[PDB]
RNA sequence: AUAAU
């Protein structure tokens, strides 16, 4: 119950469902640091990964073709990888709180009628 | 996954019987009629199962089921533990688990 | 023999 443990969770960014919405720009923010704040606030690490995550389509296709394990993620769908390293109770709580906080960044059409 | 679909999480928590061989962790977890562990589950919105060597009321029977090699009893070859399970959308599933893991700590200190 | 599942 006391030792640091690692957890990781992929969250799909629904680009197919909402192709007109710029999820990456919305995640990173107007100055590009919104995701940095979100991480520091939640005590997690968050990385935007998958097809489209590099904002350089030539380079992305190059790294994917290399077969280096660092870039395996580029085979995947666009997503945020949330990672945490803390004792079990804190690790799960942090993840729960990060997953909650990230929801607003990923739903263009949230309900606003009752 | 998508942020909305129900997901399953499971976490084993070791009961430190080796460290504290004199202490009845199982009785402490269950309480009278199992209502301690039942309450703890209901409060945390988790499922909890006590599993592993030492889990069963009955040491003769335990050894029998272990020897059967039925897969439902494989756990009896493992160390004593609580398996905490949850099924809910990702943010709620992780929160529940974090809260269960916090609440269970006091039961895994002897006195 | 705190004994749930």
Residue numbers in the entry:
A (entry chain D): 50 to 163
B (entry chain C): 48 to 158
Task: List passages from the publication reporting this PDB structure.
STAR proteins are defined by the presence of a highly conserved RNA-binding domain, the STAR domain, also responsible for homodimerization, and composed of a central KH (K homology) domain flanked by two highly conserved regions, QUA1 and QUA2.
All our structures of T-STAR in complex with RNA display a very similar mode of RNA recognition, and show that the KH domain specifically recognizes three nucleotides with the sequences U1A2A3 or A1A2A3 as illustrated for the structure of T-STAR KH-AAAUAA where one KH domain binds the 5′-AAA and another KH binds the 3′-UAA moieties of the RNA. The base of the nucleotide A3 is specifically recognized through intermolecular hydrogen bonds with the backbone atoms of I97 in β-strand 2 mimicking a Watson-Crick base pair. Strikingly, no electron density could be observed for the QUA2 region of T-STAR in all our data sets, suggesting that the QUA2 region does not adopt a well-defined orientation. Interestingly, the presence of the QUA2 region in the STAR domains increases the radius of gyration and maximal dimensions both in the absence and presence of RNA. This is consistent with the QUA2 domain being flexibly attached to the QUA1-KH domain dimer, and may explain that no electron density is observed for the QUA2 domain in the crystal structures of the T-STAR STAR and KH-QUA2 domains. Altogether, our data demonstrate that the QUA2 regions of Sam68 and T-STAR are not involved in RNA binding, in contrast to the other members of the STAR family SF1, QKI and GLD-1.
